[PDB]
From a paper:
Microbial epoxide hydrolases, cis-epoxysuccinate hydrolases (CESHs), have been utilized for commercial production of enantiomerically pure L(+)- and D(−)-tartaric acids for decades. All these three CESH[L]s exhibit high sequence identity (>60%) with L-2-haloacid dehalogenases, which are members of the haloacid dehalogenase (HAD)-like superfamily. Studies have shown that both [name][L] and KlCESH[L] adopt a two-step catalytic reaction mechanism by 18O-labeling studies.
Numbering used by the authors:
A (entry chain A): 11 to 246
B (entry chain B): 11 to 247
């Protein structure tokens, strides 16, 4: 009954928090302590989510690379007593979001799924960022979709339905996979299946998440390969 | 100097002619002999090219599955004295263009290129067809681009430059790979590199090949891995 699985990428398939922490400490040396940089990374992600919320209200799309770059410039001025960055380093730091590493279950989970389903990315990141993330995270897709293709971010209905028509299948034949409830709820509005992936470390050891009970979505799993088993995909 | 290679798919990476010939003979049984069906397949390809030519001159885009469907309906009326097809069979025959098998060099050639470059399809086929062709032809891409995304077919400039914008690179950082000269000449007009792959059997054993001289395009090869070697990509194990 499903033909394709569409995936959230940042956080759902990739550990962006550990990636961005190590990336920044690699670019900036002992100019910044780990505790301060991790705090910057958490506010960076928060800045990103807040700007996308405003843009969704405004019915606007804008390059997400620019969203990361501009919010980082803002944070760099706020933390300017503790450390500084040249313009070149700002570009290298922003590049960290295009170098996300994946959770360990992800590459083999996707391969297990492909025996029965098309697998495609549906990310709010720009098209070039998700292509680059495919290399850093070792993701091999049937197709790569981005908000850039549709002029709107998730949860907007044109993203899910544009994905379905591009893929030539019915929305009810799409299973949306995510670690973010808001993206599953939005796929539900257009008729797609829902699969929630719990990522307890998406926001680090002291992170908090709205809890998801069993039965709220069609599937509730702790890895992509667990999802593949519950969908009937043979192992290896 | 290049960041990404963009590929023509039908014919350049896939043997569409053998695919459609065997596919049709499987769906239609003894209703059609091989010789007649091969001639229909050849006219089917010609109608597709003629219709894309017209739409390009009109600056219009249309679904390519519908181009294939409508041309087959036209051909079925021209051959209607010899055999017929139900509407269900027309759908099944049209699906043949979404099941293309690749030339034998293509999977290991694409894998060899990825050590140094992004590789992406840039096809005039619809997005869903190129996604399906990835399975039948075992193509593994960094991204899939279609004329459907841009509202225009190659050779129009909005396809190559739209591809470059999506990939976050300059048109001059793209190497266009194709077995059709017209798609290379148009990529050159936007500043991209050109790589011609000779496919002597694209049109069958007695088919006519474009005869490309040396010096016309940046690269002239007989396989994707030969192209990968000339681009400095390390060999596969």
């Amino acid at each position: 009954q499903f033909r394709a699985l569409l995936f959230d990428v940042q956080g759902t398939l990739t550990d962006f928090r550990s990636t961005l922490i190590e990336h920044g400490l690699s670019i900036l040396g002992d100019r910044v302590d780990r505790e301060l940089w991790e705090e910057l990374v958490d506010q960076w992600r928060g800045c990103y989510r807040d700007e996308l919320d405003s843009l969704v209200k405004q019915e606007k799309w804008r390059s997400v690379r620019a969203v990361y770059r501009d919010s980082l410039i803002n944070l760099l001025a706020k933390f300017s007593d503790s450390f500084c960055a040249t313009s070149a380093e700002v570009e290298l730091l922003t590049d960290g979001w295009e170098r996300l590493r994946s959770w360990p279950d992800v590459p083999s989970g996707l391969e297990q799924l492909r025996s029965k389903y098309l697998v495609a990315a549906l990310t709010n990141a720009d098209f070039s960022a998700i292509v680059n993330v495919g290399r850093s995270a070792k993701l091999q897709w049937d197709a790569v979709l981005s908000a850039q293709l549709f002029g709107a971010y998730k949860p907007h209905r044109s993203t899910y339905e544009g994905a379905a028509t591009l893929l030539g299948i019915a929305p009810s034949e799409i299973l949306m996979v995510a670690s973010h409830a808001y993206a599953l709820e939005a796929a539900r509005e257009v008729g797609a299946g829902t699969a929630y992936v719990r990522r307890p470390l998406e926001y680090g050891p002291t992170g908090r998440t709205e809890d998801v009970p069993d039965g709220r979505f069609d599937f509730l799993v702790d890895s992509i390969s667990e999802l593949a088993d519950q969908l009937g995909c043979p192992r290896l």
